[PDB]
Design a protein around this ligand. Structure first.
Ligand SMILES: CCCCCCCCCCCCCCCC(=O)OC[C@H](COP(=O)(O)OC[C@@H](O)CO)OC(=O)CCCCCCCCCCCCCCC
Ligand code: SF4
Ligand code: SF4
Ligand code: SF4
Lengths: 67, 110, 156, 55, 189, 148, 393, 200
């Protein structure tokens, strides 16, 4: 995983975590399988950009999958 | 409280039409598909839309009656309508007073 | 500076910080001494509560809530101000209300609860004013997933 | 005239009086004149008898 | 008790005098001419600072992708390809949507080779929004001049009047830009 | 008022392209546009400033680039010719088509001769261009406006 | 129809349309006759999420958004968002640029004070200040369209180093003509209220805001001066050389609608005096004298230097801000505007906390609407001078 | 199929009926009663036309606050999704010969709030059928008068024999759900609250 690579978000760790508390118990279909951009990696988190008109989010390193 | 969410094509009313009006009732959800003359319809694709609406209202179980879940159901219904339009099915009609492509423009595959 | 010695004069142990560029200085209280610090600060001055901000130190870090206090005079040159920092974790966002001392943040705590999701104990009316009341989730977090709607997608 | 030379408008009726511009293109007897005022580049068209060439 | 009656009578005659003064200023307001303009018969004169449509040239372009980062929405797209015969890139297509445009003229300022231009067009009314992706050969057209149209009447705004005019409708002289242009000051003084 | 008869239809069927002078204060070409539908013509509103090139939009297919915000990649949409696809699934009675341009002031005289030749090449659609007009409703041949 | 008149209190739901001059606000009024007991305000129909916009955005891409924050003046938010990075990085500003900045800020404050007494006098009586106030504001519209290009907020005009553009040739002369003409128009508006019928007696005791309650509720702006507190923020902190001219803060004794009217009426004349002294300043005169002294004299002898320039230093489009937080305060037309900005050595900032001036003053509206009549509701709502784009944001 | 989103394919008149149709269209062209709906600075730009500088009244348009005696609605401003059913009900409570003019860049499309936004509605054409669009942020009042002129050019295209289009079909469907009952929302109860005077 580097700056500007294809990313895929899995839904196996987002059941009981700190990122699942702010989420409203459901997930959109574009977050399961699709295309996503990696903006930058500051520390342990990474910025994920989606093709929908939606502001960028922040996920962990052990929550993604390369494709 | 009359819970409803409509944009241009789907109308999910949380009541029951007796003759021409509605009453507040949390037991019946009435669906109206395409009230304005924007898309021409048939009996098979409308039945598929009704079956998808029944599947979506059977999926949402054990939740509170709020505007967010009903708007999400209406958004999934309009996404199903848009994917049915993109599948190679019925589209616009040249008989209205205004012609505005709100879902998409006719394009070429190849 | 002087506000740290004023807090230490009445036997209060706080964490002292410095100045960012010029002017303001920060005093960090975590969960318990906030009411005592506000009670011994209201007697000297600071009768005009300025504002209350809330942010994150990181995507997996804790909530930081900064109150801005400033003393009031009739006609002064430069009255000194101060900031009070509350470092509360996101597992239990419990910050006590200061509505009974100052009535300025009666809606600021409501706005912070709508934006980030901080539960304020002792609030008369803590509901949704910016977001709809049927809308769930905090939109101003570092990890906020937006549900797909017909009006929220791109315009074709 | 040629596109790429400096001209000057000399019409006393218009608001732009003696303004140096840059000719962009010529079609239908109309000349596109690009003015340079401040930090924005405006383009106001004129006629072929309105402008005068200035070296 | 009588002093309250005299105060009420004084307030009543003062209210009657105020009603008479309001009638007097209302009758005074009928003497002045209307200061409105007709459309599309008396169109206003656009100033040199008033912006409009974005004009694009296909000749003085290098496809450097600089003004895209200046735009907050990144509306001008650059369809550039890589050629192996030359050593630079060439522009193929240029499209820009105008329904989401802010019209602030920020991409025109950050341009060294002045590839974008300001065009005095504001009359944009279309029954559909899908045609707003304007082509470069559509943006390369000639703007509509308000002077050359013989059916409209040119009339300047408030700040384009000689020596100070409060109405600005007759304009019997041909003077404009109240002040002095900085060319004769170097000749006389 | 003025009780207008059926004279614009004969002038449109005789020539191939017409130019009518309307007052820009309101709307008066709607009466002729309704009389054309009463005679059996299908109207098509279109704006003359935003068209790109006439050949690549009326005869061949074009490629539209939608304005992306950096979220999506660079995509191209294949647009067919407008009057050809409007002429494909057209006819209830198979009489004729018209093309109406609203603001014909922001155009050049180079493509007008090409449009007047294109409306004479295929005898199934007409070309109606609107000019800002001078105080009266009058019709003129577009080829005479090109030649003079 | 089923209208059953009972002996229960009637809940009046004022819709969020408000089709006179107001925005979106759902007011639920609970009463039992010809008074007002309870009032519930509901907002949320104009919130656009500005704080999520500045999460990934630079300084050159945030100018139309920060100008579309408040749609009354707009240039105060631009002035604080060009003051926060120049104080975070330590970039100086020329004196003539700050003179142009304070001239444009006071000229927008004039129009912001002009757009308060229109609907406030329209909802209480005769509807004939409307056309004349709109003509007097259209004069400012034409002046700003001749100066910069637009009539209001859609105007960038500000960078980190300074102003990118300059004034035109006749703008100072038309501004002097506007200061010549604006004074009898405000003397007429003060003579409309200094000798009047029951308009003075109608809004005379409806607010009654005390001093300590206004301090505890956190009131900032003209209401704090109407209560009798001299807390003008331009006198506490000198913003851009504010200690060079003569100043006078209008202070009212009691806090009501008439006092809040006459404070802004006097503040119009104070702003006219400030822009007149600013025209009396301007060390170098208009653009004609500056261009003549530049083209007549030498290249770098006496005139062309550092103080008298366009910007002074061309800033980079993608520049890095230093790590740290910053807070500035500026007295606006509604109240005090503040920006709490946090940078962490990156192009996009981390936290953009916005301090709205009307959202803190809207808390007095549940206290103000208590025990009053039905016709005083719109006057009370118009007297605070709140904006839905500032309380929703 | 090779064609995405296809379009489905869909005479002697009298002179007196034509003149009656011209009179019926001229009456709607002459009256043209609008509705003033605005939530932002576009409402101020509309109110600048009502003043005695541009004279928007002279075409026949009079300001009315009633969404029942107006054959034309003018939506204007940034539209929040909480205001979208309000706009839908305000459009539906109008009479049947209604027209829509959308003024503004954030009204006809997403505008500036199309990059990073979760509350602004990206386009009013998803809510109400727009007849005449109007780009601009903010547009000139002369451009609003030009949109009025184009709307007047579009009204005269209507017919008196093809008047059978201003209606809505039934297409009713009845189904059941299994949702839980919700507690009610707050109506008032701000000042005389038991948690306000008594500190917990
Ligand atoms: C040639 C014919 C000219 C006839 C013109 C007369 C028609 C004018 C009638 C007025 C209609 C409006 C009434 C509103 C009046 C209004 O709203 O304010 C009425 C005002 C009420 O004041 P307050 O509310 O302070 O009073 C009640 C309180 O005091 C409670 O304690 O005072 C009056 O009661 C006095 C009424 C005197 C009214 C005088 C009217 C006549 C003035 C013109 C006299 C003209 C002489 C012409 C000589 C050539
Ligand atoms: S218009 Fe200018 S900034 Fe944009 S690609 Fe062309 S040369 Fe570069
Ligand atoms: S004016 Fe602004 S919004 Fe429009 S294209 Fe230029 S940079 Fe983008
Ligand atoms: S288009 Fe511009 S002027 Fe109109 S509401 Fe949007 S930001 Fe305001």
């Amino acid at each position: 995983i580097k700056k500007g690579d294809l990313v895929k978000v899995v839904a196996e760790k987002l059941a009981n975590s700190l990122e699942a508390l702010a989420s409203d118990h459901r997930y959109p279909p574009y977050l399961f399988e699709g295309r996503g951009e990696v903006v930058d990696i500051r520390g342990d988190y990474a910025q994920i950009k989606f093709p929908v008109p939606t502001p960028t989010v922040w996920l962990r390193l052990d929550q993604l999958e390369v494709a | 409280m009359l819970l409803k969410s409509t944009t241009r094509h789907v109308h999910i009313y949380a009541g029951h039409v007796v003759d021409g009006e509605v009453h507040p009732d949390t037991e019946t959800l009435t669906l109206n598909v395409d009230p304005d003359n924007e898309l021409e319809w048939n009996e098979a694709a409308l039945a598929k839309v009704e079956a998808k609406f029944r599947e979506l209202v059977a999926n949402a179980a054990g939740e509170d009656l709020t505007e967010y879940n009903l708007r999400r159901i209406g958004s999934d219904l309009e996404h199903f309508i848009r994917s049915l339009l993109m599948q190679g099915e019925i589209g616009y009609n040249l008989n209205s007073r205004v012609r505005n492509y709100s879902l998409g423009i006719p394009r070429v595959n190849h | 500076g002087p506000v740290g010695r004023l807090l230490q004069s009445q036997n209060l142990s706080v964490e002292s910080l410095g100045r960012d560029a010029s002017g303001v200085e920060m005093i960090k209280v975590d969960r318990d001494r906030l009411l005592a610090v506000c009670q011994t600060l209201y007697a000297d001055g600071f009768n005009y509560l300025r504002c209350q901000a809330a942010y994150d130190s990181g995507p997996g870090q804790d909530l930081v809530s900064t109150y801005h206090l400033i003393k009031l005079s009739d006609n002064a040159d430069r009255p000194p101000e101060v900031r009070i920092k509350v470092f509360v974790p996101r597992d239990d966002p419990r910050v006590p209300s200061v509505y009974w001392i100052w009535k300025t943040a009666d809606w600021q705590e409501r706005e912070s609860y709508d934006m980030f999701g901080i539960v304020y104990e002792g609030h008369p009316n803590l509901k949704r004013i910016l977001m709809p009341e049927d809308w769930v989730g905090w939109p101003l977090r570092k990890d906020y997933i937006t549900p797909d709607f017909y009006e929220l997608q791109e315009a074709y | 005239i040629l596109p790429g030379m400096t001209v000057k408008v000399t019409n006393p009726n218009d608001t732009y009086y003696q303004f140096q511009g840059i000719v962009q293109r010529i079609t239908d007897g109309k000349v596109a004149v690009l003015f340079e005022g401040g930090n924005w580049d405006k383009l106001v068209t004129f006629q072929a008898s309105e402008l005068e060439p200035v070296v | 008790f009588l002093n309250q009656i005299t105060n009420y009578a004084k307030e009543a005659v003062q209210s009657a005098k105020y009603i008479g003064q309001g009638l007097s200023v209302t009758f005074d307001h009928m003497r002045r001419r209307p200061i409105t303009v007709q459309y599309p018969y008396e169109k206003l004169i656009p100033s040199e600072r008033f912006r409009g449509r974005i004009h694009f040239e296909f000749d003085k372009c290098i496809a450097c992708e600089v003004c895209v980062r200046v735009c907050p929405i990144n509306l001008p797209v650059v369809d550039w390809v890589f050629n192996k015969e030359l050593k630079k890139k060439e522009l193929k297509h240029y499209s820009i949507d105008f329904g989401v445009c802010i019209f602030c003229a920020n991409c025109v300022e950050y341009c060294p080779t002045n590839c974008l231009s300001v065009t005095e067009e504001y009359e944009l009314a279309t029954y559909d929004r899908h045609e707003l992706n304007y082509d470069s050969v559509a943006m390369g057209r000639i703007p509509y001049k308000v002077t050359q149209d013989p059916m409209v009447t040119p009339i300047r705004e408030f700040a384009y009047l000689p020596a100070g005019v409060m109405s600005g409708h007759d304009l019997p002289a041909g003077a404009q830009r109240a002040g002095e242009r900085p060319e004769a000051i170097a000749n006389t003084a | 008022g003025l009780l207008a008869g059926y004279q614009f239809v004969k002038d449109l069927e005789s020539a191939g392209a017409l130019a009518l002078f309307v007052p820009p204060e309101g709307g008066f070409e709607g009466r002729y546009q309704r009389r054309l539908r009463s005679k059996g013509y299908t109207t098509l509103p279109m704006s003359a400033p935003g068209l790109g090139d006439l050949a690549a939009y009326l005869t061949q297919e074009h490629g539209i680039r939608p304005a992306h915000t950096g979220k999506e990649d660079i995509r191209v949409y294949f647009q067919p010719p407008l009057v050809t696809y409007h002429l494909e699934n057209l006819p209830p009675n198979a009489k004729g088509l018209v093309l109406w341009l609203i603001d014909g002031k922001r155009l050049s005289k180079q493509e007008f001769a090409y449009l007047a030749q294109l409306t004479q090449t295929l005898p199934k659609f007409k070309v109606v261009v609107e000019v800002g007009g001078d105080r009266v409703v009058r019709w003129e041949p577009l080829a005479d406006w090109v030649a003079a | 129809p089923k209208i059953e008149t009972r002996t229960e209190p009637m809940v009046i739901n004022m819709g969020p349309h408000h089709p006179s001059m107001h925005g979106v606000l759902r007011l639920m009024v609970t009463l039992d006759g010809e008074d007002v007991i309870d009032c519930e305000p509901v907002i949320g129909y104009l919130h656009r999420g500005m704080e999520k916009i500045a999460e990934n955005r630079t300084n050159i891409m945030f100018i139309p958004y920060v100008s579309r924050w408040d749609y009354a003046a707009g240039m105060f938010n631009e002035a604080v968002t060009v003051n926060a990075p120049e104080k975070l990085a330590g970039i100086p500003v020329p004196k003539r640029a700050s003179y142009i900045r304070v001239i444009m800020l006071e000229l927008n404050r004039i129009a912001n004070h002009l757009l308060w007494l229109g609907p406030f006098l329209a909802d209480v009586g005769a509807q004939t200040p409307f056309f004349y106030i709109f003509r007097e504001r259209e004069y400012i519209y034409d002046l700003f369209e001749a100066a910069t290009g637009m009539r209001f907020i859609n105007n960038n005009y500000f960078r980190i180093g300074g102003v990118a553009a300059d004034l035109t040739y006749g703008w100072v002369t038309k501004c002097r003509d506007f200061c010549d003409y604006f004074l009898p128009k405000v003397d007429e508006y003060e003579r409309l209220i200094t000798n009047n019928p029951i308009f003075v007696r109608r809004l005379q005791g409806v607010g009654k805001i005390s001093r300590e309650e206004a301090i505890n509720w956190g009131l900032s702006g003209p209401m704090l001066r109407a209560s009798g507190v001299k807390w003008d923020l331009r006198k506490v902190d000198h913003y851009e050389c504010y200690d060079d001219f003569d100043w006078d803060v209008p202070v009212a004794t009691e806090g009501d609608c008439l006092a809040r009217y006459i404070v802004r009426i006097q503040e119009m004349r104070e702003s006219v005096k400030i822009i007149r002294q600013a025209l009396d300043g301007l060390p170098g005169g208009p653009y004609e004298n500056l261009e003549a002294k530049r083209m007549l004299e030498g290249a770098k002898s006496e005139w062309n230097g550092f103080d008298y320039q366009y910007i002074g230093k061309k800033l980079s489009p993608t520049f890095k801000i230093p790590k740290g937080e910053h807070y500035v305060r500026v007295e606006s037309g509604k109240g005090e505007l503040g920006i709490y900005l946090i940078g962490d050595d990156n192009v996009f900032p981390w936290r953009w906390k916005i301090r709205p001036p009307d959202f803190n003053n809207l808390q007095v509206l549940p206290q103000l609407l208590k025990g009053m009549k039905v016709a005083d509701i719109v006057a009370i709502l118009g007297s605070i001078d709140v904006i839905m784009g500032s309380v929703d944001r | 199929p090779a064609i995405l989103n296809p379009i489905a394919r869909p005479l002697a008149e009298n002179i007196i009926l034509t003149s009656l149709n011209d009179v019926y269209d001229w009456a709607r062209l002459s009256s043209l009663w609008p509705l003033m709906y605005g939530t932002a600075c576009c409402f101020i730009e509309f109110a600048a036309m009502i003043g005695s500088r541009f004279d928007f009244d002279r075409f026949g348009l009079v300001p009315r606050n009633s969404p029942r005696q107006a054959d034309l609605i003018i939506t204007s401003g940034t539209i929040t999704m909480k205001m979208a059913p309000a706009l839908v009900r305000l459009y539906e409570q109008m009479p049947s010969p209604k027209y829509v003019i959308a003024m503004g860049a954030c009204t006809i499309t997403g505008g500036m709030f199309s990059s990073d936004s979760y509350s602004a509605v990206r386009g009013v054409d998803k809510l109400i059928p727009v007849d005449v669009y109007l780009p601009g942020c903010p547009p000139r009042p002369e451009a609003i008068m030009d949109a009025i002129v184009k709307l007047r050019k579009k009204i005269a295209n209507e017919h008196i024999n093809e008047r059978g289009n201003l209606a809505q079909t039934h297409r009713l469907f009845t189904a059941k759900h299994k949702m839980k009952p919700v507690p009610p929302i707050l109506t008032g109860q701000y000042l005389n609250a038991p948690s306000r005077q008594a500190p917990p």
